[PDB]
Design a protein around this ligand. Structure first.
Ligand code: V13
Ligand code: ZN
Length: 258
């Protein structure tokens, strides 16, 4: 009876196994745009993905992860609200059963169809497993997805999905360039928060881009054909793998822009 996304083992149950679920800096949150504070001293985000080495794509039973070689500073995030340097380890998405839901963060209560998380760890901690045990261990770049015109840089991911339909499957996934998933603007909101799935650790500097990307209905439909189950088990479509917004508590969301 492990955690997941249902009646029986979804977000409202997680706190029994992972009591920080009710902690002081949980994610995601609703981004009230009018109340976010413009901070003129926030720096532009530096996204340096040119040397990124994707390796593999994995269905982990909760989402799919596109993995990168994080054994050197290739793709890194810095600047923005951060100190030092954060290495890209993986990206994944959260999405809905319907275009009207799927994102984890919300913007003035608006839900997007999906949300991309580019996950980076602070090189001062040496590796990801140590970093998650630190309050400044991770920087997650969140990017909203709306349904409209296709994102051509996404198709390379969508098309491999049938090879990883079920939980535990992986496929080689080299030469994927995550720059093709970015919107034009790097304007952002930022706040201190947590992992949005168990173990829910309070180790994340969240950086959420204001500009969504557009993906097509057909692209997101392919996400919804993935399965939470393993091969040879009853089919449970991988949909609605998002955590709802959590109490903001004693936090201020900062905006890089006005
Ligand atoms: N959605 S999110 O970006 O916050 C995110 C991560 F990026 C992430 F790497 C993990 S994890 O702790 O690696 C494994 C979960 O059991 C997470 F748990 C997790 F929630
Ligand atoms: Zn995520």
């Amino acid at each position: 009876h492990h955690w997941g996304y249902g009646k029986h083992n979804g977000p409202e149950h997680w706190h029994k196994d992972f009591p920080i679920a009710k902690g002081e800096r949980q994610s995601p949150v609703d981004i009230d745009t009018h109340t976010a504070k413009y901070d003129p001293s926030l720096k532009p985000l530096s996204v340096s993905y040119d040397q990124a080495t994707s390796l593999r794509i994995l269905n982990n039973g909760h989402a799919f992860n596109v993995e990168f070689d994080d054994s050197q500073d290739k793709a890194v995030l810095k600047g923005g609200p951060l100190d030092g340097t954060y290495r890209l380890i993986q990206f994944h998405f959260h999405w809905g059963s319907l275009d009207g839901q799927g994102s984890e963060h919300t913007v003035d209560k608006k839900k997007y169809a999906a949300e991309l998380h580019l996950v980076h760890w602070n090189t001062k901690y040496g590796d990801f497993g140590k970093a998650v045990q630190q309050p400044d261990g991770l920087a997650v770049l969140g990017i909203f997805l709306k349904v409209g015109s296709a994102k051509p840089g996404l198709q390379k991911v969508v098309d491999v999905l049938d090879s990883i339909k079920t939980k535990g499957k992986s496929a080689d996934f080299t030469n994927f360039d995550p720059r093709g998933l970015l919107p034009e603007s790097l304007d952002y909101w930022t706040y201190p928060g947590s992992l949005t799935t168990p173990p829910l650790l309070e180790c994340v500097t969240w950086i959420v881009l204001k500009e969504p990307i557009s993906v097509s209905s057909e692209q997101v439909l392919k996400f919804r054909k993935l399965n939470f189950n393993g091969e040879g088990e009853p089919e449970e479509l991988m949909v609605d793998n998002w955590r709802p917004a959590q109490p903001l508590k004693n936090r201020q969301i900062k905006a890089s822009f006005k």
